[PDB]
Design a protein around this ligand. Structure first.
Ligand code: NA
Ligand code: NA
Ligand code: NA
Ligand code: NA
Ligand code: NA
Ligand code: NA
Ligand code: NA
Ligand code: NA
Ligand code: NA
Ligand code: NA
Ligand code: NA
Ligand code: NA
Ligand code: NA
Ligand code: NA
Ligand code: NA
Ligand code: NA
Ligand code: NA
Ligand code: NA
Ligand code: NA
Ligand code: NA
Ligand code: NA
Lengths: 542, 542
């Protein structure tokens, strides 16, 4: 029989029962409506020259500064794959939308806006802090995501202006930032800079809300470890300076403890929604799984509130305060017509160690090692990278688990005749590089098969690899060799798949994700993303 | 055209207190046939063909000491190899071996020949072998080890009636932290163990009584990670806050010097898929400067003064001692027939800051920046990489000096119409990767031209780059895209060139090198190395 998520949950509950409903959850029924796949990327099968024309403006138009798309009077004025569209997410506080040349990737903005403006109780956003890129300390979001969020909150304020109660809005980012350039001694100044940026972000939001409104907005940063010279809180065998920092890496937009957007997307517009997009995936799902996401948020916010090295501030009732929103209720209440759509079984898995919870609290790695070790037919993987270069050049591999590593599980799968198909970012992907070529991964697996219980002679092992392992890297069209992917995706037996933040390559960052178990949903995901991507990926023969 | 005298005069004006410490007045030195120790696959062939040089027929085998095929006549040797019985295979009982040797083995011939001729001293400075799974190795690996041992055996026989002992120093820069920063005591213990085993291995191939006083030692001058090691950098991050020796020297009798980019790592240069690199073999008063460099380090090792602790041990007169060889006399005495060969002007140039000497003692960067700023016709550069990835992804550029950066100097040369030809390692070169593609370098120099005193509009700056800048990466035949280079080479005006350890990409490691000023010698170097390498390199347009 094929992989059942129930088996994953049973294994975790047997081995880590103290983290049930903390870093994983009993599978529950949730609902996927049309549009639930938020896969953003260039148009597979074309070319970057063609796709990038989608952002060209004719002389009499211009590129909008808020959304970085061309203005627009009808479809004829839009190039590439774009069309003329007046999305609701361009609607500013005075109600006026803009005509822009939009592209399919903007579906993610549609999903964020639509989810936020419907809030009746709470909006809960967890992300990673934008990267430097010279332009001074941005926080929470960049590019079109910022305007989208602002416009959504404006609309939310109008939609709730006669509400009985206030809406809790939480924005939390994992912060890298003392560490980027010099470093571990300077934490005080860094807090000061973060405080300024966060205050300006909140002030900008407040300036597009009515003077009196029912939104209680908190912004904050979290980092759980800055040690560099010693362990952050884990059971790793590997040791490396770059593993000895930690902040949140999970990515969540959770409305009313009901509607969750989660996946690999940071809220960084230039990386996904402009020229030369990075490939990435999130999903939009509704149901009790939101509870688990809410719990994840609560764990981090509790940590921020009872250890404020970190920083936060909230604006409510016309005032800045340090009222800290540590807890949104995780109890699930089905909205009306919640059962609309495709019903699927889903469990959560998280990684909350390295200074937030106890060092044993990494159940995400265990669940994926189990999934790969128990695949019966196939494993499909799409990642940015599978290995990560340590501080002085050491290759760091996916982390050790009571059940071994991902690489050991994949070696077991290959020996047993399970098909393993892998898509990596390109080696020449700049900031989003795979770090290591296909040959490296092939030889790492070869060496795993030389040792361990297998003891295979090298040439004999190559027959297993050559029959069952196929490693490609992402390409828009099978020709370009510098395209980029940020996926954290895997699919077992065309049945069970992961969407979240957790890269296969190692780090100490906290992570959140979900495991869906359903053939119809997996088939939609493969039709929409995996098959096109695979057909256009490039294979470097060994 | 550029004169090395002007470089010396500039250093002496700005840094007179480091005269005869990190630089020297140009002196006349001598280059005999074979002085160019460039090792690489045979340009124009293929990796398949070249690698066949190490295949053994069924009835022969691959020698474990030298990792070459055994051999009866040329017909049993494939690839570009021939059947040869080199002196450096001669073991302590006098028996050489017949092996299938290749041109790159010239470096072994140079080392052996120089060491066995020693009457007073053998001074070896290098970088510790990388820990790729194997042991902690020290000083040398693969064929180099066997060469050194054999040389020392022969040296003992050659000096067995000597009036005085021969001082033999082996010093390696050691990575710190080893494969966390917290365990320095254990680090030293492991280093001591490896050095002891290496010394005992040497002792076991010397006569029981002999006139060789042999010291082995490790040096690291900074392990802080969280703060500056001792420099005037504007850039900061963690990977620059450690330091150890990177200079590479084999100095016999304060007369004969081999120096350049080669570590004594056999598998990286002298087996299949060779990394490209360059050393030279030179005789004359320049050796004095090399001796001084060694003394500076060995003094540091012997007189720690505190903080970081280093380790060494000596074997002499059948006994292990802590007799520390802090000083070999640097006074040059010309050997008989020293003037044999091509007479060339040479100066020394070193980097000894970051914890050994004062923080201002980085004259190597200044020298190269001056040389580039004052090129009048051409700059040829062959490097592994020009930029280096920092701890958390920040790009680290060649370092600031009182005369600017290397990139500022190259931008100036390009604006003035000077041709700049650059050969880089391949991006897909694994351990020896360029780190950044050619486009990155082009765009970095574009940005330099946008700022600074030029303030050039982007498209106008591109005209200078497109006319005068040519960035290629190394290839055996203009097709293979994963070949590797470790060069640290530059040539100005087909006249002045650097050979040594100092990469253009930044680090805090100590460095030694020399600058040769001679048209005939530069022409020999261009004919043997630069021109074939250039002709077989690959250019990625745009
Ligand atoms: Na894409
Ligand atoms: Na309500
Ligand atoms: Na939040
Ligand atoms: Na581990
Ligand atoms: Na954190
Ligand atoms: Na995208
Ligand atoms: Na867009
Ligand atoms: Na995707
Ligand atoms: Na993943
Ligand atoms: Na990560
Ligand atoms: Na996860
Ligand atoms: Na051979
Ligand atoms: Na030495
Ligand atoms: Na600098
Ligand atoms: Na040397
Ligand atoms: Na070589
Ligand atoms: Na060889
Ligand atoms: Na070379
Ligand atoms: Na130099
Ligand atoms: Na330097
Ligand atoms: Na090179």
């Amino acid at each position: 029989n094929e992989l059942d998520v129930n088996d994953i949950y049973d294994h975790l509950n047997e081995k880590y029962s103290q983290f049930n409903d903390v870093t994983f959850s009993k599978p529950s029924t949730n609902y996927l409506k049309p549009g639930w796949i938020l896969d953003t990327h260039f148009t597979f099968g074309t070319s970057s020259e063609f796709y990038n024309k989608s952002f060209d403006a004719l002389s009499f138009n211009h590129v909008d500064s808020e959304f970085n798309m061309s203005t627009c009077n009808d479809d004829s004025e839009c190039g590439g794959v774009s069309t003329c569209t007046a999305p609701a997410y361009t609607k500013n506080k005075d109600g006026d939308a803009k005509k822009l040349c939009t592209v399919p990737a903007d579906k993610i903005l549609d999903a964020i806006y639509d989810n936020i403006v419907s809030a009746k109780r709470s909006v809960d956003i967890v992300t990673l802090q934008p990267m430097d890129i010279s332009h001074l300390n941005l926080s929470f979001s960049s590019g079109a995501f910022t305007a989208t969020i602002k416009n959504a909150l404006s609309q939310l304020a109008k939609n709730t202006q006669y509400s009985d109660h206030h809406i809790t809005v939480r924005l939390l980012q994992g912060s890298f930032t003392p560490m980027l350039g010099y470093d571990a001694e300077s934490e005080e100044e860094e807090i000061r800079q973060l405080s300024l940026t966060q205050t300006n972000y909140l002030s900008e939001i407040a300036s597009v809300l009515p003077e009196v409104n029912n939104l209680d907005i908190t912004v904050g940063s979290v980092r759980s470890c800055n040690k560099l010279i010693s362990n952050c809180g884990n059971n790793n065998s590997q040791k490396d300076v770059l593993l000895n920092v930690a902040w949140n890496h999970g990515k969540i937009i959770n409305v009313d403890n009901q509607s969750v957007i989660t996946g690999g997307h940071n809220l960084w517009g230039a990386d996904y929604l402009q020229r030369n997009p990075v490939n990435d995936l999130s999903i939009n799902i509704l149901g009790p799984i939101a509870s688990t996401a809410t719990k994840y948020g609560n764990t981090l916010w509790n940590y921020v509130c009872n250890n404020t090295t970190n920083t936060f501030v909230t604006y409510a009732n016309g005032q800045y305060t340090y009222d800290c929103p540590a807890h949104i209720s995780s109890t699930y209440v089905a909205p009306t017509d919640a059962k609309n759509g495709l019903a699927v079984k889903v469990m959560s898995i998280s990684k909350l160690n390295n200074g937030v919870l106890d060092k044993d609290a990494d159940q995400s790695e265990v669940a994926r090692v189990y999934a790969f070790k128990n695949a019966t037919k196939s494993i499909k993987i799409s990642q940015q990278a599978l290995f990560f270069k340590g501080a002085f050049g050491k290759v760091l591999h996916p982390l050790k688990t009571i059940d071994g590593t991902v690489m050991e599980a994949l070696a077991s799968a290959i020996y047993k005749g399970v098909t393993v198909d892998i898509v990596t970012s390109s080696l020449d992907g700049g900031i989003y590089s795979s770090g290591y070529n296909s040959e490296f991964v092939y030889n790492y697996l070869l060496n795993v098969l030389h040792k361990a219980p297998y003891y295979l002679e090298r040439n004999y092992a190559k027959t297993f690899l050559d029959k069952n392992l196929h490693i490609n890297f992402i390409s828009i069209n099978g020709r370009e060799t510098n395209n980029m992917s940020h996926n954290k995706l895997w699919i077992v037996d065309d049945k069970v798949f992961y969407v979240g933040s957790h890269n296969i390559y190692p780090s100490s960052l906290q992570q959140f994700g979900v495991i869906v178990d359903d053939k119809d949903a997996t088939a939609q995901l493969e039709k929409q993303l995996w098959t096109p991507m695979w057909k256009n990926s490039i294979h470097v023969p060994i």
